[model samples]
Target: SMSWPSTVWHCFLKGTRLCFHKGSNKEWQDVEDFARAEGGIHKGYGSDGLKLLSHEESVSFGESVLKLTFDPGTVEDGLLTVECKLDHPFYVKNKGWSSFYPSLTVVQHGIPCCEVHIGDVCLPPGHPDA
Candidate 1:
């Protein structure tokens, strides 16, 4: 079973934007991988938005679903909060990733709201290559 790592729902404090690809080829990149190679995440930037050519692998649990959402609905101190929820069956609680789950949620406070979940595999939200 997975319990709240820092504060059950840190989204209430962190969370910046919704990071998901919707058919435009915009996919999340691995931050560690980028960090190792000349700051791979910081090395790239897109005009408005960039479409990543590669597709990320998906990790799934029985009857468990992940949802990613973005909202300009609320902002605090000039920061935006994006909400993401991983709706998993109670039986599959152990399957969530501690470092990454429910896709990426960006947080400027280093709270790690941005995450990419490939089931058991998780990645930090980095820039995608266009």
Candidate 2:
């Protein structure tokens, strides 16, 4: 398993005010862009229209990697069912640049949709499934 920064709380605790002043303007601007982009993406919901119980976010790959953690608030007994959803595809050839695939439309269960989760997806070591 890959390890994350042990001091991750420091970044979250300090809040955005400190980051804006400490980092370069370009860095903060990029952060803003990512936030805006995420708002445009479709959000995930659990089985049976269950609401999310928790979420966490992480960024890497020069701010191109957008990792999100979500708890669907649905559990069978004491077991937890975690799922991964690839909402969009992107091809990266270098740092800070990625070519996103075109959005496609489809119908699932007679409902129109563009994104859905695949069950039991696996990621190789050092991949961004964290």
Candidate 3:
């Protein structure tokens, strides 16, 4: 579970946005595959010249059923954020690529908000990808 201060909720209610960007298409596909593998459903964007898409998953959080949405842009980056309970369950999607820099944000009340600085995935020296 994750905890947020009341200020986080206030900022979301006031209409703030969150941002995210993953550097590779393979990484994004891995995300999509896992969500589907775990009984999640997706919508919005794909095929025949379509470029936008979003995936939503239902998370049973005790008395509340919180929804997690994966909204990706045409390019390899995106921004989004909002308000919420401090004790809400925290979930993150993807395990990072071996050498790329990626970052993501947590969403509040169906909107994106906080910035999570995810620097880079370190690899051992002399590793193939490194």
Specify the highest-TM-score model's number: 1
Better of 1 and 2 by lDDT: 1
The true-versus-predicted C-alpha distance at residue 1 of model 2, in Å, is 41
Off by over 4 Å in 2: 1-45, 64-67, 77-130
What does candidate 2's lDDT look like per residue over 8-109, in tens digits?
Answer: 111111112111212123133233343344453222222222222222334543342223222333442121222211222211112211111123211111
lDDT digits (tens) for residues 1-130 of candidate 1: 2223332221122222133333232344232322344322222222122212222233344433234332221222121112223421111112322323422322312223333332222212221210
| Candidate 3 per-residue C-alpha lDDT over 26-124 given as tens digits, one digit per residue, 9 for 90 to 100 | 222323233334342222221111111232223334432222222333543332111122323222223222111112233332323232223222222
Model 3 CA lDDT for position 45: 22
Ranking by lDDT: 1, 3, 2
lDDT of 1 at 122: 24
lDDT of each: 0.26, 0.23, 0.25
Query: lDDT of candidate 3 vs native?
Result: 0.25
TM-score for all models, in order of appearance: 0.20, 0.19, 0.19
